[PDB]
Design a protein around this ligand. Sequence first.
Ligand SMILES: COc1ccc(CN2CCOCC2)cc1OC
Length: 150
Amino acid sequence: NQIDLNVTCRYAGVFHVEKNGRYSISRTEAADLCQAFNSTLPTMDQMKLALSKGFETCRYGFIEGNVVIPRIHPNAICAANHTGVYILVTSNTSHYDTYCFNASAPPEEDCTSVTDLPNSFDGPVTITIVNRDGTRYSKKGEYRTHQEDI
Ligand SMILES: COc1ccc(CN2CCOCC2)cc1OC
């Protein structure tokens, strides 16, 4: 009973979370997941500022109201070569990664590793935070409040 959460640097408090190395988070799960990091789904404004500080990914993830990819460099296989916060317009499917926003994080680039999941609750899952540098933090708990996300 294990969940891997790959996380990134924070940029103006915004970061990306990928669950189990696949697009596998629902919108409800994403809000609960960010809540476990004492975080919220970023607003479009928060994501734009994060982008201006150096944030980009090549993965669709939830923000408040939309599913986006922040892009700095145009890459043909990431957000169809677009730059800026690319908004997913048409998709059949509902599961993506998520972005999260931690208001207490540093204002610009914070590429230190994540060493806690401070607001997860009691549960049976071994949740492992996997940083880009491989370092890991694991704890037994749960963050999913909606049964259909479990
Ligand atoms: C040992 O099994 C479990 C332990 C804890 C939980 C999570 N809680 C969270 C609060 O509400 C009740 C369940 C689930 C479990 O089995 C699916």
